[PDB]
Amino acid sequence: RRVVAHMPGDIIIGALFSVHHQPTVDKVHERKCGAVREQYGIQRVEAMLHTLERINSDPTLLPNITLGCEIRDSCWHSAVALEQSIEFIRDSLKPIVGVIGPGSSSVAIQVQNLLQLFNIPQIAYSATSMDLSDKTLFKYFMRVVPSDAQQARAMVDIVKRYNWTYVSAVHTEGNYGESGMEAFKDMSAKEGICIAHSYKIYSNAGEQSFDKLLKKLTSHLPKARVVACFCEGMTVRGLLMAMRRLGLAGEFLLLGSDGWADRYDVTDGYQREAVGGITIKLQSPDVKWFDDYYLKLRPETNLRNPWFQEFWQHRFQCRLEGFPQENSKYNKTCNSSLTLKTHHVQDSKMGFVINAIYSMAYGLHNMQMSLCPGYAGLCDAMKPIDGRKLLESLMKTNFTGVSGDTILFDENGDSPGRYEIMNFKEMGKDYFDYINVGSWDNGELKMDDDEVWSKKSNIIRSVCSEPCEKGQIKVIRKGEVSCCWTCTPCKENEYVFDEYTCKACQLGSWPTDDLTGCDLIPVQYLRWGDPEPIAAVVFACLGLLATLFVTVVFIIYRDTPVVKSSSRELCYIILAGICLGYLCTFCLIAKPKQIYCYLQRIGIGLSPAMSYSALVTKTNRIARILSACAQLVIAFILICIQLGIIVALFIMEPPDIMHDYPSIREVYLICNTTNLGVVAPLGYNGLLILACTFYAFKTRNVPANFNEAKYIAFAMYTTCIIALAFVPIYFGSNYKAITMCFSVSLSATVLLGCMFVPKVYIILA
Amino acid sequence: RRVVAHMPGDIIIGALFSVHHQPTVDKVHERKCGAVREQYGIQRVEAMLHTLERINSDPTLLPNITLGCEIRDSCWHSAVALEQSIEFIRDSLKPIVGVIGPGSSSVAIQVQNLLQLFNIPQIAYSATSMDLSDKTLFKYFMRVVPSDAQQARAMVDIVKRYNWTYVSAVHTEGNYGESGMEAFKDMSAKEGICIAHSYKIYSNAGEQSFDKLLKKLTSHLPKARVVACFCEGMTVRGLLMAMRRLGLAGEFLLLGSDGWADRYDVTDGYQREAVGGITIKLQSPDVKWFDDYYLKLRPETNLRNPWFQEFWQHRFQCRLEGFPQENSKYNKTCNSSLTLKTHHVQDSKMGFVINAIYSMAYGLHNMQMSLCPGYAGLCDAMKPIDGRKLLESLMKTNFTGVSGDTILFDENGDSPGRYEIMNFKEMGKDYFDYINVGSWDNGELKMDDDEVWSKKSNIIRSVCSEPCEKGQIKVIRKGEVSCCWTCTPCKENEYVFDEYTCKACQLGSWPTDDLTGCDLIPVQYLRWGDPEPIAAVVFACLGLLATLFVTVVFIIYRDTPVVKSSSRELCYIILAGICLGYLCTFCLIAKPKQIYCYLQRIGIGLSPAMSYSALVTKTNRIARILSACAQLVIAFILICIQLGIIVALFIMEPPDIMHDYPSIREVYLICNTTNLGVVAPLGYNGLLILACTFYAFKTRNVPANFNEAKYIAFAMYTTCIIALAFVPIYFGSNYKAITMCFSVSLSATVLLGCMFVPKVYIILA
Ligand SMILES: *[C@@H]1O[C@H](CO)[C@@H](O)[C@H](O)[C@H]1NC(C)=O
Numbered sequence A, B: 001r002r003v004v005a006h007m008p009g010d011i012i013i014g015a016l017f018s019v020h021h022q023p024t025v026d027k028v029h030e031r032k033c034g035a036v037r038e039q040y041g042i043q044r045v046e047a048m049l050h051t052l053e054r055i056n057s058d059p060t061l062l063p064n065i066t067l068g069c070e071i072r073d074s075c076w077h078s079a080v081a082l083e084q085s086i087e088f089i090r091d092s093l094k095p096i097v098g099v100i101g102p103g104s105s106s107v108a109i110q111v112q113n114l115l116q117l118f119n120i121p122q123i124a125y126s127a128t129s130m131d132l133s134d135k136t137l138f139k140y141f142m143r144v145v146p147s148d149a150q151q152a153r154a155m156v157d158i159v160k161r162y163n164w165t166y167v168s169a170v171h172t173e174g175n176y177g178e179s180g181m182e183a184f185k186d187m188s189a190k191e192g193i194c195i196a197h198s199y200k201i202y203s204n205a206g207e208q209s210f211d212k213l214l215k216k217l218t219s220h221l222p223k224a225r226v227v228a229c230f231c232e233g234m235t236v237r238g239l240l241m242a243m244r245r246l247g248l249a250g251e252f253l254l255l256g257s258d259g260w261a262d263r264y265d266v267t268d269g270y271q272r273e274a275v276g277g278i279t280i281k282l283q284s285p286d287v288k289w290f291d292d293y294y295l296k297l298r299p300e301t302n303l304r305n306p307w308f309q310e311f312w313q314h315r316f317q318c319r320l321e322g323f324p325q326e327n328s329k330y331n332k333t334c335n336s337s338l339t340l341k342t343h344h345v346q347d348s349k350m351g352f353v354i355n356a357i358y359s360m361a362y363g364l365h366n367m368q369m370s371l372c373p374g375y376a377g378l379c380d381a382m383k384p385i386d387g388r389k390l391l392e393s394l395m396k397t398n399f400t401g402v403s404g405d406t407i408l409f410d411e412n413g414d415s416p417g418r419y420e421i422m423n424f425k426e427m428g429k430d431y432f433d434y435i436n437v438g439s440w441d442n443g444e445l446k447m448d449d450d451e452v453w454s455k456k457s458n459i460i461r462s463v464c465s466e467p468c469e470k471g472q473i474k475v476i477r478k479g480e481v482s483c484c485w486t487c488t489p490c491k492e493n494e495y496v497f498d499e500y501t502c503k504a505c506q507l508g509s510w511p512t513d514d515l516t517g518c519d520l521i522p523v524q525y526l527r528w529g530d531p532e533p534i535a536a537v538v539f540a541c542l543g544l545l546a547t548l549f550v551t552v553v554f555i556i557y558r559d560t561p562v563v564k565s566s567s568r569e570l571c572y573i574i575l576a577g578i579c580l581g582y583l584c585t586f587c588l589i590a591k592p593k594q595i596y597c598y599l600q601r602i603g604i605g606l607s608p609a610m611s612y613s614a615l616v617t618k619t620n621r622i623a624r625i626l627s628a629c630a631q632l633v634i635a636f637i638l639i640c641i642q643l644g645i646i647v648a649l650f651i652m653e654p655p656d657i658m659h660d661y662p663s664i665r666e667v668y669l670i671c672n673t674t675n676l677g678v679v680a681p682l683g684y685n686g687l688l689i690l691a692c693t694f695y696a697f698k699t700r701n702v703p704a705n706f707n708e709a710k711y712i713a714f715a716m717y718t719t720c721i722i723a724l725a726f727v728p729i730y731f732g733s734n735y736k737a738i739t740m741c742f743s744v745s746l747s748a749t750v751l752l753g754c755m756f757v758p759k760v761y762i763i764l765a
């Protein structure tokens, strides 16, 4: 059977330390674990052997009673550890009062399922699963190291700190890896992280499995460069050997967990491939007295550690002759000058092992003090040491560790801890070692960003797509990982609403700069000034001066017989209307306002009706004679026909400015002028024009005072064509106001030019 | 301690049957399992304690040797089963050759991890998890039921058959639920299904936990109406209890699994909450010879089974007076008239238990006949029965099952099997039953869709969003599962590229019907129909007729002195140009072509200019005299200017068809006409017109033949005004061709109608 390392005592506590390597894949069934381990094996085994013969020699802990030990090998396998635990409990079918729990979390679970039946407390130093924190299933399990929830949080913090978004995930099969990845996914995908794929692999899988895994990992190589390994000690080594085999030598940045840590045995011979990796290590200062005791050890003297001779032969490649464990495999013979001092590395968690073997001692001491305070030794009430009492005392245990910090188990049998984010760099030529960079204690991580990536060209960001926010572009996600987007550009009309929708602005509106929001488009009107309104207003002003001159001539020659042929008042109402129609242009081309446009409508309406109606009455009188003072009256009544019409139109169309939007980009303001509200007065004016066309066609060339009718007929004919010429523009355009102004102005200055100008032209003679 | 049913023999098989219920959450640590179970307990115990006395009686199976037993209760818990297994192996520290392992995945693995260390083959009848198919970790585990991969495939088939896409999932904590749900998730998310959320719950959790789980499940009533368990017996019952408590009676459709099967003890008293649910049950015909043995049992005589009296007093809520197990909790007593024939239901896994026991017996028989073929009994070669040999013999066993089929173990340790879909329907009022509605065997699925939902208003398909492949509204996904999409339209000119993106068509193009594709929109041209161009062509034809009449008169009355004041040809060329006007109109309104382009340009550039040059020469000769044949040459030199300038513009701009895009919806075909390419000939025409105006008023009214000077000046004035009247429309419009046609026509019929016509007006007398 297997060998065991006894040491005598009054109270015996067990331990399970992974002295030998994991059994190979092909010999799992035989359960014959392979090579020996130094750090995880002989160092730990020696620690107990010492940290009990310190406790025994110390009078202040457990006086007059001697803790012994039975240290037994678990080969880091759940099957072997279970058989060893069975060997532990064979006595209960001297009793074992407790064990120092095996390193692996899955192995810890397997051994706990058996130990809790016989009420045997178990203390772990490296088991770091969340699954072991549930006291319903694991009542008799306590740890001196924090859970790996905090470790997953630390890894997530590291990932989020360096913009890393698109990462790959690898985890060892078991409880450690499974729980690690579960926590990592749950608490990462929430915040910002985005896992490309997750792969699982056994520690003892063949090289073929690792090759396949590396191919699958390289499948996403261009984008996902960070691999987040909640993996174990040997899984990462397998990955490194696969990397060496496949020729890939630094396209990945492995992001380890507390299986890689500070360990040198996982990067021996493959330092070129793992350079740049970030690991997370439970903090524990190196003990000193253990080194002093350990370095002086020799294979000749240490008989109490049955694995010592084999390890001694394995480390320095030679053989021992004068001892049974010759192991003739090694050729040369060891000389009496070899020592462990050279290339001596004391692993992490050597603080934790001693802290455990203490916590157990302090629990025993407290329960001894409580049960029989008077006696000093094994009292009658202690001979069958009760598991329940021991666990009750152990739950509330509280002391100072070797590191100087204090140890307390909370309600979950757990102890708090701080992480230390190591980094694998290359100091000199062919010289690699782990460099402490950061830390993480209770959600706060201090990181030396300078030490990692001693430059500004850090590792390529593990992102699926570049930041898509340069302007109008707006990301669309194609069903796959929510962190792969395309850069589809929205249109100029819309602005980015969120980041996945862009929404159109109002009918009169435009997106602001940088597409941040939307704001009202500036309004445009016919400003006072401008090219064309000057050409309008100068025409209007010169027309006003001309008509003032004409009325001055009229009033001067008030009683002249050559002009006292027609009704003088009739030849007045014309010019008054002309003047009003002239000021109509001025009140038309102006800043749109409530007070202005109704007056503008009145101007465009009445003047070219009343003046032309006076002309109609004059032509009526002439044609009928070829009456009395009633004609001035009929004029007034004829005018009014229109005043009533326009006042009626004023009701359904009150003067109020509305904004016009011919296109999405420009906005104009005009009042309630409408096609129906303009055509009707223009229609009436047109009807009057057609009525007076008949009388024009009647008069032809009648010999009158200075041949007035001959000029007025031609004038009215010209006005007809000028009026009908401008309709296509006015129907469809944005120049309605200026066109109306021009049309009115040009319709005027023509009738006066032929009805009054020749009279004034010859009035000088 | 815990009682253990014995039966003496030579070779003792063990077994673990869940006689008692799972220990409550509060008393897990005490390990006191609660109430007794009939189906999963006493029925199975009675089965084994018979089959192994039928086998003993049978001479053809294991002759001259008597199989025994040692049934123990696992209480459906990992902890209790482990201690029972320890009790099994205590002898090996009579030996137990093997066990009929517990039917529970987690319990199976827990017992296996202990048994394989002692080479004890274990056969499970109800452990269907996938994890137990690995022979690297579970070399000593065989089962007579198929794995859960097939069951997950069956559930996925059922889900996909009824269009169910947005589903919710709950699985019992443990190896069975976890593995089953992992397989279901993979195999569903691969194909087309879409899980809203996944919940995990322990089967023995309090009512508060189930209430919280049901709240989380009701968080998605509107869409996720199907919840697909893969959960255990006493987890669907928890769901039903929560449904009863918070008053849901059909808001969900539970889709059960092998755990639910058709068990009547998971819906007793909660039928109203579970109506309509679909379950999956391993097919096993009811064994008949077992019923005859079972129904005749009496508590007075049956003293092999130690649990039988307790079960008897539990089933009939009474107490037995004459035996120590009085259990005075019950009030009334039991008369000698109770019989198990009332409401007798046989569990749906009684085939598999007997099959497993037969398998173990046949394996033992094979190994017996191989090791010592001659001797009939237990030869000396098997006093220490080796577990390895027994496992080797078991792995290749092959016999006929109780149901009728054959039992064989493949290389993976499991056995083939077929499933049976079932539906829990309310047949009569206050009467419910499980109805077989199909089956599932090796991939192919048959379902009687008529029996389930005997209507068309079935359970609403659980979809997060309506299928939005309608019209042109596209699909956008929003950071949640690629099944909860909001449907948005895109622009009318845009056609759908794929299900998620739409893009606009070309500058000149339009999306086809149903927005599937894009096609070239037909071009729009100056159609020969329509009222306006028909009127234009009629006017051009009338102009041609007028010119032909004029030339007929012109020639008839050529040499006559009344018209022989000016050069007939000076007049003729004018006539040639006026005809060329109408020819230009004809060549303008047509299909725009390469030839027609330059022809139309030549016409418009030449005709009016060459006519007006002759006109100005004719006017200026008379004006200056108020000569000879030099007038024709001095006019031709002016005519050459248009030819030169048009040739220059021809060199600058070649004639070609140009396709214009006024809007995204309208496309026209026009020529390469340019503003600068037409303004210059217009400029020359204009300066010629103003020169003619200058020459006009000089002559004013001159007495000539029919007083030509009287009319021609007025005619040209009319031409000038009509020319400048039409230009605003041509400046802004889309009807350039027809506007130019009208302009040319109007400029025509005036140079003749009152300049040539008066000459011939009195030519007939
Ligand atoms: C990205 O990382 C850099 C430092 O590596 C720093 O700007 C910050 O942590 C991140 N920036 C953004 C915009 O997320």
Ligand SMILES: *[C@@H]1O[C@H](CO)[C@@H](O)[C@H](O)[C@H]1NC(C)=O
Pocket (backbone or CB within 6 Å): B161, B162, B163
């Ligand atoms: C939905 O299921 C029905 C059968 O129940 C069948 O038409 C097809 O599988 C699905 N129909 C559509 C339109 O996808």
Ligand SMILES: N[C@@H](Cn1oc(=O)[nH]c1=O)C(=O)O
Pocket (backbone or CB within 6 Å): A103, A104, A105, A106, A126, A127, A128, A129, A176, A232, A233, A234, A258, A259, A260
């Ligand atoms: N921490 C791991 C165990 N472990 O694996 C290694 O390779 N080192 C180490 O400590 C766990 O909690 O399971």
Ligand SMILES: N[C@@H](Cn1oc(=O)[nH]c1=O)C(=O)O
Pocket (backbone or CB within 6 Å): B103, B104, B105, B106, B126, B127, B128, B129, B176, B232, B233, B234, B258, B259, B260
């Ligand atoms: N089939 C389950 C076990 N099981 O759970 C129940 O509630 N019934 C039942 O058979 C498994 O394979 O784990």
